[PDB]
Structures are given as C-alpha cells and as structure tokens.
Design an enzyme around this catalytic site. Structure first.
Site, PDB file in Angstrom:
ATOM      1  N   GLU A   1     132.370 -29.626   8.649  1.00  0.00           N
ATOM      2  CA  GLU A   1     132.896 -30.605   8.709  1.00  0.00           C
ATOM      3  C   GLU A   1     131.368 -31.712   8.650  1.00  0.00           C
ATOM      4  O   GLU A   1     132.239 -32.286   7.350  1.00  0.00           O
ATOM      5  CB  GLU A   1     132.723 -31.633  10.157  1.00  0.00           C
TER       6      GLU A   1
ATOM      7  N   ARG B   1     134.527 -42.409  16.692  1.00  0.00           N
ATOM      8  CA  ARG B   1     133.064 -41.717  16.504  1.00  0.00           C
ATOM      9  C   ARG B   1     133.092 -42.390  14.804  1.00  0.00           C
ATOM     10  O   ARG B   1     131.611 -42.074  14.004  1.00  0.00           O
ATOM     11  CB  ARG B   1     133.963 -40.213  15.562  1.00  0.00           C
TER      12      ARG B   1
HETATM   13  N1  LIG Z   1     138.800 -22.762   5.037  1.00  0.00           N
HETATM   14  C1  LIG Z   1     139.430 -24.436   5.590  1.00  0.00           C
HETATM   15  N2  LIG Z   1     137.976 -24.554   6.832  1.00  0.00           N
HETATM   16  C2  LIG Z   1     137.867 -25.397   7.495  1.00  0.00           C
HETATM   17  C3  LIG Z   1     139.397 -25.975   7.467  1.00  0.00           C
HETATM   18  C4  LIG Z   1     140.257 -25.562   6.993  1.00  0.00           C
HETATM   19  O1  LIG Z   1     142.043 -25.354   8.031  1.00  0.00           O
HETATM   20  N3  LIG Z   1     140.312 -24.510   6.168  1.00  0.00           N
HETATM   21  N4  LIG Z   1     139.029 -27.303   8.951  1.00  0.00           N
HETATM   22  C5  LIG Z   1     138.045 -28.183   9.338  1.00  0.00           C
HETATM   23  C6  LIG Z   1     137.549 -28.620  10.254  1.00  0.00           C
HETATM   24  S1  LIG Z   1     138.536 -29.882  10.402  1.00  0.00           S
HETATM   25  C7  LIG Z   1     136.348 -28.363  11.193  1.00  0.00           C
HETATM   26  S2  LIG Z   1     137.057 -29.443  13.040  1.00  0.00           S
HETATM   27  C8  LIG Z   1     135.898 -27.258  11.415  1.00  0.00           C
HETATM   28  C9  LIG Z   1     135.986 -25.953  12.472  1.00  0.00           C
HETATM   29  O2  LIG Z   1     135.191 -25.391  12.532  1.00  0.00           O
HETATM   30  P1  LIG Z   1     134.655 -24.564  13.090  1.00  0.00           P
HETATM   31  O3  LIG Z   1     135.604 -23.336  13.923  1.00  0.00           O
HETATM   32  O4  LIG Z   1     133.648 -23.492  12.937  1.00  0.00           O
HETATM   33  O5  LIG Z   1     134.412 -25.650  14.429  1.00  0.00           O
HETATM   34  O6  LIG Z   1     136.128 -26.335  10.051  1.00  0.00           O
HETATM   35  C10 LIG Z   1     136.667 -26.291   8.864  1.00  0.00           C
HETATM   36  N5  LIG Z   1     136.722 -26.261   7.480  1.00  0.00           N
HETATM   37  O1  MOS Z   2     138.581 -32.723  12.030  1.00  0.00           O
HETATM   38 MO1  MOS Z   2     138.258 -31.147  12.634  1.00  0.00          MO
HETATM   39  O2  MOS Z   2     137.733 -31.984  14.534  1.00  0.00           O
HETATM   40  S1  MOS Z   2     139.813 -30.308  13.521  1.00  0.00           S
END
Ligand SMILES: Nc1nc2c(c(=O)[nH]1)N[C@H]1C(S)=C(S)[C@@H](COP(=O)(O)O)O[C@H]1N2
Ligand code: MOS
Ligand SMILES: Cc1cc2nc3c(=O)[nH]c(=O)nc-3n(C[C@H](O)[C@H](O)[C@H](O)COP(=O)(O)OP(=O)(O)OC[C@H]3O[C@@H](n4cnc5c(N)ncnc54)[C@H](O)[C@@H]3O)c2cc1C
Ligand code: FES
Ligand code: FES
Ligand SMILES: [Ca+2]
Lengths: 760, 450
Positions: free
Chosen positions: A713, A309
């Site tokens: 992200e 990536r």
């Molecule tokens: N509050 C909170 N937000 C977060 C996280 C979390 O661990 N806690 N993980 C992140 C990561 S690594 C990703 S990949 C996305 C995943 O969100 P999604 O399900 O909408 O893709 O949430 C992000 N936001």
């Molecule tokens: O780092 Mo979010 O790809 S779990």
C-alpha cells in the site's frame, strides 16, 4: 530463496490462459445464474413491488425479496446492519431490492429489468454540505484528536496558510468483477468466491443460512484484482448465492456485469479537507489544524477504520509540535464507501502535503527544503513522537530523499525547467518531490493474527497453505520462498494450495499491507516445527546434536554424512514422525486507544519518496507525466522483482487517482460514471516516459519476516508527487495560488491555470 | 444457417441460430475460458482475440464481434497462442521473464494483442496496446516485454493459418444489399457492430431482421477519383487511417485517438456516420475538410455535403430503404488541423472535437471551414464565427476578437465529461490554438519529449 527475484507463482498459467478465475470454474449443467433488481431512487419508501413480469420472464426459476430471506439479511462488515435485499425502503440508486435466479446470466439480467416498483420519494442527502446541514452522520458526532494547543501555536506564527480543497473518490476497477458460486453440500454449503476475506464470507453466509460456521466452507484460489474492493463487497454475492442455493436445491453463480458492479459497490471515500498550518521564521512547523469531511455513503461499511487511518496520517512525513484533527464521517445516499489501497492513508497524507505546499508558496520558499527541514529526525535522549504518541524510531527520509535528489538530478533539472518555461507561452513544465510515511498493521488490533498449515509428503514434495489471498501482489510466491528458505530446499518442491477456511481458520482480510508480514511469520513458524522434528530425528539416529543438522539446498548434513531431503523425509515417515504442522503469528507491541487517539497502533513505518515531472497545456489543461524517479524502502525485500512491480503499479494507480479518475453523480443521486467508457483509469500511454524505480535496501529494525517491510500500500502514496507536480506547473503561469483541486483533470488543471493567471 | 472458420488451427462448422450472439459468449460457452470478459463494452481489451484473412491478421475485441462476422476467417485465442508442441510464443516467455503480469486477468488480451503485433512486426506499442487496460502493473514491464520479444523470429505455427478457405442476411455486393434493404426498410444494418453490440449487451435489446455489411468487398474500397478520393462506407477506421497518413496527416493524427486499435480494426466510417452521434470524431473532421456523402436506395443515389446529413440530435436525412454508400474527400487540404479534447488521451470520448480549415490569400483569410462535435446536438460548422472571419487578417488578435461569436454558434451541455463552461471555453481555445500552431509555435503536449 528469500531475496531472489522470482516470478509470480502463476506466471505461466497467466500467460497461456490456463489460470482459472471464479467465472471459469467448471460447474454442473443445472447451475442457476443470479442478478439483482436495483432501486431507481436515491431515497424512498417502497410502496408497491409487482414481480409478476419477472417470474414470467423466460428462463427464470425463482425470484426473491427480503421477506424470502430465511434468516439474517445483513452484509455489513460492521456492527450496524446493511441489508442484502432492501427492507421496505431504499437508500441509494443502485440498492438491490430483489433477486432473480434463472438458467442463464443474460436471462437473469433481462428479468431483473421488468419489475414494477412504486416508490414514495423522500428528500435525499447527496452532498457533504447537505449532510452537515442535516447532521446525517456515523458515530453520533465528529472524532477529534489533539496534541498540544494549535490555536495558541497558530496565533503566534511568523507564517501561516489557510486553505480548503476537495479530493475525489476512486473506483477500484479490478479487471475481474465481483463473483461467487455456491454448491449445496449435504447439510452445508461450499462457496467459491473472489474475495480478500473468505472468513467473513464464511461468517456472513452462515448467518444468512442459520448454520453454525462449521457447515460452510469458503475456498478462493485467486482474484483478478482486489485493491481493497473485495475486502467486503464480496458479502452480497455470496449471501445471495447461498440463499438461492438453499431454496432451489441447486448450485448458484452470480457475477456482476460491469455497470452493475460500479453502481452497486463502494469506492474510496471522497474527502473535503480544511487546513490551517504555520511555521517558525526558520521554517520549522509550529502547528497544523485540520478538519476532515468524508463522504461515506449510506451505511457504515469500513468508514470507521478508514477515517481513523486518515487521522493517523494527517502528519504526513513531518514532526509537528501541535496538531488537531476533527473528523466527520458523513452519511449520504450514495454507494457505501470502502477500502481502497491506502485505506484512509492517502487522504490524510495528501491533506498535509497540500498544506505544506501552500505554506511554502506563501513564504517564497522551495517546498523541498521546507519539507526536508521538517521530516522526523533520523534514528540514533527523547525520541520524537507522532500526534498519537508513537515514537518514530526509524525515519530514514532525510538520507533517502537526499539520495533520491542526487540520482534524480533534481537541482539541475529544476533550473532546466525554469528556463524552458520562460521561453514558452502555451505549455509549462512542472516538477515536485513527495515523501511517504505509512504505518503498517490493522488499527483494529486483534486482526493482527495469521495462520498456516504445512505438509510434507513422503516423496519430499511440500504443500503450503496460509490464510492470505492472492490478488496479484505475489503473496503466494513470497510464502513459497519463505518456506523453501526455512526448510532448506528448492522452491520448486513447494506447492501453494487454495485459500480455504477449512485448512486455516479465523483469518483476517488480506489487507492493510499485512498479508506477507503476517502470513510469512506463520509459514515460518510451521516450517520451523517441521525442521525441528526432522533435526531431532536425524540427530538421534546419527547420534549427535540437532542444532548441528544442516538443511540446505535440498540436502541434509549431519556428522559428516550427507543425504537428499527426500531420503530424510522417507526415513522420518518410517520412523513415524508426523510430517504435518500448523503455524500462527500475532503481531507484538501493538496497543492503542481510538477514542483518545493515543498509543502504538503500528509496528513500524514504511517510507519512500518520488520526484515526478509533468507538462501542461495552458489553453486546455491537457497534460501528462514525462518522467518519474522513485526510491522506496521495502526493508530487506523478500522479492525485489515482485516489490519493484508493486511499486510501479501502485504509483500509476495513485497518479490515476489524482488526475483522470473522476466519479460523478447527477442531481438525483445516479452515478453517471459507471463504465470504462466514462470512468478513465491510466491507460498504456499514460505511463511515465521515463520511469526509474529503485529500492532502499536496509533491514527493518523490527523483527519482521526476514526483516522485510510491507510494500503493497505505501507506494500508492508516491502518486501524490504527480499531483504536486501538476500544481507546480500551474504555479508557474502566474503569481496567484492556483488552488488546484483533486482530481486534477484537464478541466480542473485549466481552472487552476486561470486562477494563477488571475483571469478569474 | 451454417458458417465455417478455422479455430486455433482446427476447422469448425457452426449452426448459427442467433446471429447476434457475440464471439465472446460462443467461446466461453465452448469452454475456451481463456478469453475473459472485463467490461463487455469494448473498452478493456481483456477479451481480445486474433482474426486473419486475406487482408491479414489483426487483433479485435471478441465482445463486439458477433458470429456471422467470422465466417471464412481464421481465429486464434489465447489458448492457441502457444505452439502445438507446447513451446511458448516469444511474447509469452518475455511476459514471464519481465513480470508483465500480476493478477493475470488482463494477461490473455495483452498476449493476444502482443502476438498479433509481433506477426506483422508492428512496434507502435502505445497505440497497439492502448485498448488493453491493466490495473495492476503500471505498464512498464509489459513494454519491456514487447521490446524483448521483438527480436525473435515470428511464430511459424501462427502464419500457417494463412492457407485457410483456399436467420440473418449476408450480402456479397452493394447491389444485393440495396435490393434487399429496399424490401426491408426496417432491418438493422450491422457493419463493424461496435455501436450496435452495446444495444444487446448493455441495453439488453433484441434485434430481429439483421444484415451484415462486412462481407461486401465493393462497399469497402478506396478509389482514386478525378476530383478526390471515394471512400466506401464499409472502410474501417484503421484502414482509413492508413490511407490518410499521406494526403491527410491531420485526419490521420486524429484517427490515432479514435477508440483503440482493436476497435479501429473493425469499425467503419460509414457506421460512424450512420450512427449520427454528435460526438462522433469522423464527421467534424470530414466537414472541416468539406467532404461529401453519398446515400443510396435501390439504384437511386443522392449526394449532399456531409454537414447537411445531420438534422437534429438523433435524426438524419435518411430515407426508408436508404443507406450510406460512401464519402468523398478532396485530394488535399493542408489547412486542416484536428483537435480532440477528453479526460484521458487514449481511448476516450471527446468533450469537444475541433476541426479547423482556413485558406489564405497571403495574410488575408479567404475561406473558413470550422467544425465542432460535442458542442451541440449535432456536428456543425460555427457559421457566425466562420463569417466574421472572412477578409480579416490572420493574426492571433483578430481571432481573439471573434471568439465571442462562438457563444452564439453554440450552447453546449454539461455532463460527466465536462461542464458547459469548460466546453465553451475549449472551443474558443481551439481557435487560439490553430493560429498559434500555423504560426509555428509549440502547442502540443503530446509532442514534448522528456
Ligand atoms: N497486483 C495487485 N497488487 C496489489 C492489490 C491487487 O488487488 N492486485 N491489492 C493491494 C492492497 S489493497 C493490499 S492491502 C496489498 C496486500 O498485500 P499483502 O498481502 O502483501 O498485504 O496488495 C496490494 N497490491
Ligand atoms: O486496501 Mo488494502 O487495505 S485491501
Ligand atoms: C470502446 C469504444 C470506443 C469508441 N471510441 C469512439 C471514438 O473515440 N470516436 C467515435 O467517433 N466513436 C467511437 N466509438 C463508436 C463508433 O461509432 C463506432 O465504434 C463506429 O464508428 C461505428 O462503426 P460500425 O460499423 O461498428 O457502426 P455499427 O456498430 O456497425 O452501427 C452503425 C450504426 O449505423 C447503422 N449503419 C451501419 N452501417 C450503415 C450504412 N452504411 N448505412 C446506413 N446505416 C448504417 C447501424 O445500423 C447502426 O445504427 C467507440 C466505441 C467503442 C466500443
Ligand atoms: S470485455 Fe472489455 S473489451 Fe471486451
Ligand atoms: S495484471 Fe491485473 S490487470 Fe493486468
Ligand atoms: Ca468497487
């Protein structure tokens, strides 16, 4: 319901302490507790293993070693194995070597400290340099991608900048620690765990136990934080609980105590980035050559996609006619690195931002115009491509940055800062703008699928179930909104149920910011089958056409008549029409070739930009963010409250990464920073004093769930702006290249202030 | 041994058999699963709980607090923050309305801190919540929430606890203590417990022969004296901070960044000194201000100048049976100025702590008290530097010329917090700082407003 700023599905439960996390679940009185005995050597053969003092420790019931493993001994998310218990040798300080089950968590920990292990040490690889020297690596050789001919382009370049810089890793620091629980269930097992990827837990436990997948069920209702750290490092705990459970006949729970968590699990990969970049006389880029060295740890884990990536983002936000990347994934004797918000993105992106800044100082140009000049072209003959060959047809950066610069009062403020600096000798203010372009979807294509299952009961209430896992990002509330919008009813009628591999199977990790894009589609796909069945039923009854049946706001309307959603459902029940449905979605248009580095690995890109202003103390390096202004593109957001909240949180997480957060290992490989008291995440007063965030509101061009865009992200990359600002402040203290390294701690800011001041 | 306390409004009587068990474990073992364990080391706030007694109410970390300590107090956890009829506290509703939670896991601790602050109407949020980490939200929305709930009448149900109470040794008087310690020299004396609990939770130790000093009212006094102020050993860092706001703002400003409010509320100066850590923040300051320390053994009573108490790394001028009873501070020291340098401002350990006190005879330097923590195995004055400073003029350049002597006074370490070079260079930078500050120049990053 989509579009409204509604609270997280579990707000009240969070705020009253009713919400349960894994370690709060009630469990039988006979449940054991587990703890691993860890290697004290970075690299060695194990020569003697006396566990007698362990078995004799109070409260201990069983003790396990690799030779006790009934079947597989392998927790890796990748084709090469990573043992759960050490097999005759160890590879880092922290590797689990044996497993204790006792009648209490403390009693387990205590026993885990009494073994007598003898080792035969071997030379350890702890530094990129050592790794390169030794040719210790994954994928038998570097990966190289190239568009056009760089050396040619850089040889004929009016301006040029060469540089090298470190980017340190980052610990997730999820407030809830890794944890799992296994309950024997006649023949099979049920695992409860705290993980972003229950189907993999299912897969790995099954293999550890010699069971077909259908005999292992994984449920997971919520994690207190993931950030990528639970995409896979959940595998060890679950495997261990399942194996202990099978052997003792009893339920088995394992949680890592914080210190263990930091010593055993992986972190964001640290990088070394070497660059050469150059431009035209007008300022258009001509080419960029990057070399990436990435520290991956002792086993491959998710290094592969992670480094892919970073390559994919080495273009940052800019069109570059010629570009080369040579990517080394270096194996060393330390914690096996892994996913972390951004997943390689930020490392590659930060590589190009540093470069371009370096370039700009070099030609005495303002970084902002140089950047602005090189953004990919707006949309709407021949569209520009990325170095991997993907048309970039949605770049709004130009407009967006402009809009942010005005709302931010950029130009004026920059002057106010110049003045202020010249009047000060001990402190110096700094400000920077930084853009973001992040592709969405897993680069391993076939993970881009998602499923759901929906049920309407005869009182009309609805239970929704999908494959993603909630870790705080509001996934569940968003799916609640998508369903209530597609069925025509109030959200309060929709209830979310725990993620469960026996309800939606073969799911992918919740990650790559694809949780809502894909699960949303799947939820809609299921809700649409249902609605279709109901419209077909209302239509035959009231003699008319299905497309004229309207569902809205808890009411159904047909042929001038109107009824409550419940009455429609009860009648459908009496008429024998199934009220249950699965849903599934596979992201379209994707296809690419890793090895050649060409294709369309992403559906669309998310964008945003931030402007951060900070100050530094020239005597000690102390410093802090004064103000941030962000403008971010979440498509037609599904929930702006929840989006603004991801953005704020991701910002602070990114700046944390590039300022106070620092990992340190000692000469022998031991992690020295392994506790909140020595590893420092942003604390309450570290928040920006003025924090303005706003969303760019434009539907996505691509057909995503209500034309929204993933927002999890991407926003983490906005933190680069803070690092860029710290560097602007150093640059104001002298005429030399400050060469500020990441993480920009106070010691490091001070070093960059001196180079600039020419004091060495 | 039986103790009693109020728990979330209810009377509770408990048979202590292990006096070392932390409040956090007793609770989760009773099913009060709402208090979470996020680090088990005092840093995260996730286990924050609210205690109350005559001095009033405060928020503290349940993971650092052993049971014996809460005898006679009222205890409130997250499950008791709401009213008995289920009405949410203004702080809970505000957190919901402003999205102050995401994953939820640090939410309880935040709510409890927030509720405690609300109960006494405190508004210094950055300092009150420093000790509650949240990795998800960015903190912003939690501030909006605190602001929004501040305009709300305090919860009545929470103040009604006021009316309450109205193996291991628990002395009530300094005399009882002295007597007993004298007989059990080898005992383990527990005050705040903030350094000792880490021996049991992380080092996995077991401590027999234990005594709690937190119930000796007479050891925790601030007495005005003819020639200074007498500060009892059991005085908490928070309380010492409150006192110092007036006569010793510099020390007050320092104590602001001493751990977190939760730890300040129970940690003691006596304990900070008896622990003898070269990175203590108390000592350097006190030495720069030339305070004195008072030991005690039975009825005997020595009395040296603080700096003299520290011999070598991990070793103090303490006698079998002897304990710290107080410290004495001058009524004033306008020359004092305290500097702490760490990776993060709040709730961090010092790389270097610089305390400076220079007295002047108009333009000339009369006396020089210069102290450092974290520059050596022990907190100590920088002699050669101090020396070369006397009689010289108080201008930046004179100081600039003496810096090198610091490299003779100390030879700092390298470790995860900082490199030796950096430490060194920083001790020297503190010196430039002092002149620049006294000369009225802008020097502090924390005083810069946006
Ligand atoms: N509050 C909170 N937000 C977060 C996280 C979390 O661990 N806690 N993980 C992140 C990561 S690594 C990703 S990949 C996305 C995943 O969100 P999604 O399900 O909408 O893709 O949430 C992000 N936001
Ligand atoms: O780092 Mo979010 O790809 S779990
Ligand atoms: C999260 C966190 C942050 C911290 N931050 C800081 C900080 O920034 N700066 C800093 O300096 N320290 C810090 N500390 C440690 C600090 O020393 C303690 O918090 C505290 O000052 C010691 O007070 P106490 O009563 O709890 O000591 P205790 O834990 O009760 O222990 C004191 C030690 O000395 C002994 N002792 C206690 N009282 C006496 C007595 N009167 N006579 C003789 N011996 C006695 C005890 O037996 C023990 O050996 C931090 C700790 C934590 C948990
Ligand atoms: S568990 Fe983190 S402060 Fe108590
Ligand atoms: S909401 Fe997850 S830590 Fe605060
Ligand atoms: Ca981790």
């Amino acid at each position: 319901s989509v579009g409204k700023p509604l609270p997280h599905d579990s707000a009240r439960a969070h705020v009253t302490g009713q919400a349960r996390y894994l370690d709060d679940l009630p469990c039988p009185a006979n449940t054991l507790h587990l703890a691993f005995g860890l290697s004290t050597e970075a690299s060695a053969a194990i020569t003697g293993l006396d566990l007698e003092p362990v078995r004799e420790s109070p409260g201990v019931i069983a003790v396990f070693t690799a030779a006790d493993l009934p079947h597989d001994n392998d927790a890796s998310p990748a084709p090469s194995p990573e043992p759960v218990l050490a097999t005759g040798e160890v590879h880092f300080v922290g590797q689990p070597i044996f497993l204790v089950a006792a009648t209490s968590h403390r009693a387990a920990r205590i026993a885990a400290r009494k073994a007598r292990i003898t080792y035969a040490p071997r030379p350890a690889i702890l530094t990129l340099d050592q790794a390169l020297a030794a040719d210790s690596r994954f994928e038998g050789g570097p990966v190289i991608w190239a568009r056009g001919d760089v050396e040619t382009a850089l040889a004929g370049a009016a301006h040029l900048a060469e540089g090298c810089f470190e980017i340190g890793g980052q610990e997730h620091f999820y407030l809830e620690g890794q944890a799992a629980l296994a309950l024997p269930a006649e023949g099979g097992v049920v695992i409860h765990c705290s993980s972003q990827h229950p189907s993999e837990i299912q897969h790995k436990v099954a293999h550890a136990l010699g069971l077909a997948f259908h005999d292992v069920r994984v449920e997971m209702r919520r994690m207190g934080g993931g950030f990528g750290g639970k995409e896979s490092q959940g595998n060890h705990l679950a495997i261990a609980c399942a194996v202990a459970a099978r052997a003792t006949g009893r339920p088995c729970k394992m949680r890592y105590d914080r210190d263990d968590d930091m010593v055993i699990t992986g972190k964001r990969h640290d990088f070394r980035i070497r660059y050469r970049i150059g431009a035209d006389a007008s300022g258009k880029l001509l080419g960029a050559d990057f070399v990436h060295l990435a520290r991956c740890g002792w086993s491959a884990d998710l290094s592969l996609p992670v480094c892919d990536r970073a390559m994919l983002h080495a273009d940052g936000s800019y069109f570059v006619p010629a570009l080369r990347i040579e990517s080394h994934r270096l194996r060393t004797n330390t914690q096996s690195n892994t996913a972390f918000r951004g997943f390689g993105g930020p490392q590659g992106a930060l590589g190009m931002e540093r470069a371009i800044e370096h370039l700009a100082r070099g030609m005495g140009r303002d970084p902002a115009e140089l950047r602005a000049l090189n953004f990919y072209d707006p949309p709407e003959k021949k569209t520009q491509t990325t170095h991997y060959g993907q048309e970039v047809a949605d770049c709004v950066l130009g407009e967006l940055v402009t809009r942010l610069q005005k709302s931010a009062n950029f130009t004026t403020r920059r002057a106010e800062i110049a003045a202020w600096n010249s009047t000060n000798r001990t402190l110096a203010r700094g400000i920077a703008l930084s853009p973001v372009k992040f592709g969405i979807s897993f680069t391993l294509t076939h993970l881009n699928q998602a499923g759901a299952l929906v049920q309407i009961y005869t009182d009309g209430s609805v239970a929704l179930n999908h494959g993603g896992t909630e870790m705080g990002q509001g996934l569940h509330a968003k799916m609640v909104q998508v369903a209530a919008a597609v069925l025509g009813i109030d959200p309060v009628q929709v209830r979310i149920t725990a993620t469960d591999t026996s309800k939606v199977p073969n799911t992918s990790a919740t990650a790559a910011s694809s949780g809502a894009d894909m699960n949303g589609m799947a939820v809609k796909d299921a809700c649409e089958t249902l609605r279709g069945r109901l419209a077909g039923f209302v239509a035959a009854r009231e003699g008319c056409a299905a497309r004229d049946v309207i569902f809205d706001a808890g009411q159904v309307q047909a042929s001038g008549k109107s009824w409550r959603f419940a009455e429609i459902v009860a009648a459908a029940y009496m008429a024998r029409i199934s009220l249950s449905a699965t849903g599934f979605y596979a992201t379209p248009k994707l296809s690419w070739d890793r090895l050649r580095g060409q294709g369309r690995p992403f559906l669309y890109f998310a964008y945003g930009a931030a402007i951060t202003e900070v100050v530094i103390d020239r005597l000690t390096g102390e410093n802090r963010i004064l103000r941030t202004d962000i403008l971010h593109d979440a498509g037609a957001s599904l929930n702006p409250a929840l989006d603004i909240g991801q953005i704020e949180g991701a910002y602070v997480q990114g700046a944390g990464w590039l300022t106070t957060e620092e990992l340190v290992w000692d000469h022998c490989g031991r992690l020295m920073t392994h506790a909140p008291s020595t590893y420092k995440i942003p604390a309450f007063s570290d928040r920006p004093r003025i924090f303005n965030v706003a969303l760019w509101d434009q539907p996505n061009r691509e057909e995503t769930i209500f034309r929204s865009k993933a927002v999890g992200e991407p926003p983490f990359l906005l933190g680069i702006s803070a690092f860029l600002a710290l560097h602007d402040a150093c640059a104001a203290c002298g005429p030399h290249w400050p060469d500020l390294q990441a993480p920009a701690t106070p010691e490091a800011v001070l070093a960059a202030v001196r180079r600039a001041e020419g004091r060495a | 041994m039986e103790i009693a306390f109020l728990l979330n409004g209810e009377t509770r009587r408990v048979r202590i058999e292990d006096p070392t068990q932390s409040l956090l474990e007793l609770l989760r073992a009773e099913g009060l699963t709402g208090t979470k364990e996020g680090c088990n080391e005092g840093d995260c706030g996730a286990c924050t709980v609210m205690i109350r007694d005559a001095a009033g109410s405060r928020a503290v970390n349940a993971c650092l607090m052993m049971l014996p300590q809460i005898a006679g107090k009222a205890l409130r956890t997250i499950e008791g923050i709401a009213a008995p009829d289920g009405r949410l506290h203004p702080v809970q509703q505000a957190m919901i309305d402003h999205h102050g939670s995401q994953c939820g896991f640090c939410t309880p601790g935040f709510i409890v801190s927030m509720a405690a602050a609300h109960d006494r109407d405190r508004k210094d949020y950055d300092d009150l919540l420093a000790g509650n980490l949240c990795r998800c939200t960015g903190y912003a929305p939690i501030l909006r929430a605190a602001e929004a709930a501040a305009g709300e009448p305090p919860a009545d149900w929470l103040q009604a606890d006021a009316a309450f109470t109205l193996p291991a040794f628990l002395p009530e008087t300094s005399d009882a203590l002295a007597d007993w310690y004298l007989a059990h020299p080898e005992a383990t004396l527990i005050a705040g417990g903030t350094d000792v609990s880490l021996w049991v939770t992380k080092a996995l130790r077991d401590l027999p022969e234990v005594a709690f000093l937190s119930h000796c009212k007479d050891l925790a006094q601030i007495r005005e004296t003819p020639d200074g102020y007498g500060i009892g050993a059991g005085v908490t860092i928070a309380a010492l901070r409150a006192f110092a706001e007036g006569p010793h703002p510099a020390l007050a400003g320092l104590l602001r960044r001493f751990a977190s409010e939760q730890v300040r509320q129970v940690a003691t100066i006596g304990g900070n000194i008896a622990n003898g850590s070269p990175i203590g923040d108390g000592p350097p300051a006190l030495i720069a201000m030339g305070a004195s320390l008072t030991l005690r053994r039975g009825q005997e009573r020595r009395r040296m100048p603080l700096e003299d108490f520290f011999l070598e790394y991990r070793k103090q001028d303490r006698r079998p049976g002897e304990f710290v009873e107080s410290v004495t501070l001058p009524k004033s020291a306008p020359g004092l100025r305290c500097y702490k340098l760490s990776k993060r401002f709040d709730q961090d350990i010092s790389a270097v702590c610089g305390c400076l006190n220079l007295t002047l005879k108009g333009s000339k330097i009369e006396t020089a008290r210069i102290a450092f923590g974290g520059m050596a195995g022990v907190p100590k004055r920088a002699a050669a530097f101090e020396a070369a400073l006397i009689g010289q003029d108080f201008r930046e350049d004179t100081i600039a010329a003496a810096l090198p002597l610091l490299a003779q006074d100390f030879t700092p370490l390298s470790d995860m917090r900082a490199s030796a070079a950096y430490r060194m260079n920083a001790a020297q930078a503190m010196a430039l700082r002092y002149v620049r500050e006294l000369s009225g120049e802008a020097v502090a990053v924390l005083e810069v407003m946006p």
